[PDB]
Design an enzyme around this catalytic site. Structure first.
Site, mmCIF file in Angstrom:
data_model
loop_
_atom_site.group_PDB
_atom_site.id
_atom_site.type_symbol
_atom_site.label_atom_id
_atom_site.label_comp_id
_atom_site.label_asym_id
_atom_site.label_seq_id
_atom_site.Cartn_x
_atom_site.Cartn_y
_atom_site.Cartn_z
ATOM 1 N N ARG A 38 0.818 -1.213 0.000
ATOM 2 C CA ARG A 38 0.000 0.000 0.000
ATOM 3 C C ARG A 38 0.850 1.261 0.000
ATOM 4 O O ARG A 38 0.318 2.355 -0.025
ATOM 5 C CB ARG A 38 -0.926 0.027 1.214
ATOM 6 N N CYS A 66 5.403 18.462 -0.905
ATOM 7 C CA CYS A 66 5.436 18.161 -2.322
ATOM 8 C C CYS A 66 4.315 18.792 -3.054
ATOM 9 O O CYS A 66 3.331 19.259 -2.459
ATOM 10 C CB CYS A 66 5.431 16.661 -2.490
ATOM 11 N N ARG A 91 -1.705 18.937 -5.144
ATOM 12 C CA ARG A 91 -2.205 19.972 -4.230
ATOM 13 C C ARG A 91 -2.925 21.136 -4.950
ATOM 14 O O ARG A 91 -3.714 21.866 -4.344
ATOM 15 C CB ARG A 91 -1.053 20.496 -3.378
ATOM 16 N N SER A 92 -2.625 21.325 -6.233
ATOM 17 C CA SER A 92 -3.300 22.322 -7.070
ATOM 18 C C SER A 92 -3.171 21.896 -8.515
ATOM 19 O O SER A 92 -2.120 21.447 -8.925
ATOM 20 C CB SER A 92 -2.716 23.741 -6.900
ATOM 21 N N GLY A 93 -4.250 22.020 -9.275
ATOM 22 C CA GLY A 93 -4.229 21.679 -10.678
ATOM 23 C C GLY A 93 -4.788 22.820 -11.504
ATOM 24 O O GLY A 93 -5.889 23.310 -11.246
ATOM 25 N N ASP A 94 -4.006 23.248 -12.486
ATOM 26 C CA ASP A 94 -4.446 24.192 -13.501
ATOM 27 C C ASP A 94 -5.310 23.445 -14.539
ATOM 28 O O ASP A 94 -4.795 22.717 -15.382
ATOM 29 C CB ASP A 94 -3.207 24.831 -14.133
ATOM 30 N N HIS A 115 -8.424 24.688 -10.218
ATOM 31 C CA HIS A 115 -8.690 26.059 -10.630
ATOM 32 C C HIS A 115 -8.650 26.305 -12.141
ATOM 33 O O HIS A 115 -7.922 25.643 -12.892
ATOM 34 C CB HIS A 115 -7.728 27.013 -9.916
ATOM 35 N N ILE A 116 -9.456 27.269 -12.560
ATOM 36 C CA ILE A 116 -9.392 27.840 -13.896
ATOM 37 C C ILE A 116 -8.974 29.317 -13.814
ATOM 38 O O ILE A 116 -9.611 30.112 -13.112
ATOM 39 C CB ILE A 116 -10.777 27.737 -14.604
ATOM 40 N N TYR A 117 -7.911 29.691 -14.526
ATOM 41 C CA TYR A 117 -7.529 31.103 -14.615
ATOM 42 C C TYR A 117 -8.579 31.878 -15.386
ATOM 43 O O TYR A 117 -9.167 31.341 -16.318
ATOM 44 C CB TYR A 117 -6.149 31.269 -15.259
#
Lengths: 248, 248
Positions: free
Chosen positions: A112, A132, A152-155, A193-195
């Protein structure tokens, strides 16, 4: 059986309708939703999005670059993947996260803790024990290899479609050399998020109907991850909608 | 508006129907599905499950214990949360992950790197650079605090309901001292599993209809995370189904 890309489009829609305005490092502005997950099958198909043309050659090439070395830009003539520490922390030193993932799949497929992490290198000098940017977990089920990416964040407009392809490619590779078949790629986001300057392009992409995903054929038997070359890969049946230029 | 607990029950059902048999460290056997996500609102309600009685007192007490110290068992007369390294790596040394989360919420609420990790301490001696067991990310949106827990493996019968309560409690606490309102708790799993000897109990729990979630009142104004005491908390309106003994 509903097209997997529909998940991505549903996420775009959801962020447009129900997303909150939030600033970022560039104070540029985004619409944000916190916490998301999409599941893409890798079984006899490859999730290269079709509602716009994704730069497949850059995906492949940047991935190979990450796999062998290397701390020196241009040389693939800081990305959204961030694989600088996948191999090192330079020949045969530090912890080799990727090789360790490969070895664990072979020595204990039920494990795992089959996990690899990537850091944004701008964080490294910033603070002690930086978090990270991306956590990548692999699982084996009935001779199938699955992969879950936590970012942790995606464009959503630029980075996400590219990453879906990158990690699915990674999974195909590791499957190939561990003698497994690819299963699912699960994509999980923190800040999704979206710019603001991507809102109009994406609203248009939403109107497009996805075409069946293409296939990814591997043309040669490869034994080590470091041995893969660009020419070892073929995308059959990619019939996407036209390119959408998203500015950044 | 559909009860949040329905997500948990849906996950149990899905694993029973579509889950694969897989062994673990104890070679005891589980049914496993890889990659899952549930979203629980914390807005004017607290996600203490009602289809069985969850040991609230142990949740609270174990959480407080994690928050102040401490490397010495019994003293709460190795859990499913694993918060041994939340404060230390002992007074005023190492990196204080929790305090840093609190400070970041106050100094830059838009930050995407508001992350705390927990390790299973059996991993620590096992290998260099061990992967964490759980990654916890916080986000702030419109004066609301949300939290996402990523666990590389979740025990659905015993560990998961307990963790949902733990991290929701944590979120209420940090919200309280940062002057925010709790938003969502998002629960994401890698290996989501049911042990075989839990199958019958859970099949029965599935038949139960959830009651409205209770509320969690904080009775005093607290300024520091270390100051919270058990008596500072009250669960109003917990009306659960009877206790289900799951053996482990």
């Amino acid at each position: 059986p509903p097209h997997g890309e529909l998940q991505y489009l549903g996420q775009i829609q959801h962020i447009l309708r129900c997303g909150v305005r939030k600033d970022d490092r560039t104070g540029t502005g985004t619409l944000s939703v916190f916490g998301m997950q999409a599941r893409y099958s890798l079984r006899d198909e490859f999730p290269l999005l079709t509602t716009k043309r994704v730069f497949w050659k850059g995906v492949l090439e940047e991935l190979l670059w990450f796999i062998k070395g290397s701390t020196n830009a241009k040389e693939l003539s800081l990305g959204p993947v961030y694989g600088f520490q996948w191999r090192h922390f330079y020949s045969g030193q530090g912890v080799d996260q990727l090789q360790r993932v490969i070895d664990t799949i072979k020595t204990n497929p039920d494990d795992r803790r089959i996990i690899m992490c990537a850091w944004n290198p701008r964080d490294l000098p910033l603070m002690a024990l930086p978090p990270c940017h991306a956590l990548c977990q692999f699982a084996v089920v009935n001779s199938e290899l699955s992969c879950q990416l936590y970012q942790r964040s995606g464009d959503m407009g630029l980075g996400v479609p590219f990453n879906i392809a990158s990690y699915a490619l990674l999974t195909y590779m590791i499957a190939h050399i561990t003698g497994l078949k690819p299963g699912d790629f699960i994509h999980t986001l923190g800040d999704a998020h979206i710019y603001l300057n991507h809102i109009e392009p994406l609203k248009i992409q939403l109107q497009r109907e996805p075409r069946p995903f293409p296939k990814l054929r591997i043309l040669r038997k490869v034994e080590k991850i470091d041995d893969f070359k660009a020419e070892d890969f073929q995308i059959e049946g990619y019939n996407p909608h036209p390119t959408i230029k998203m500015e950044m």
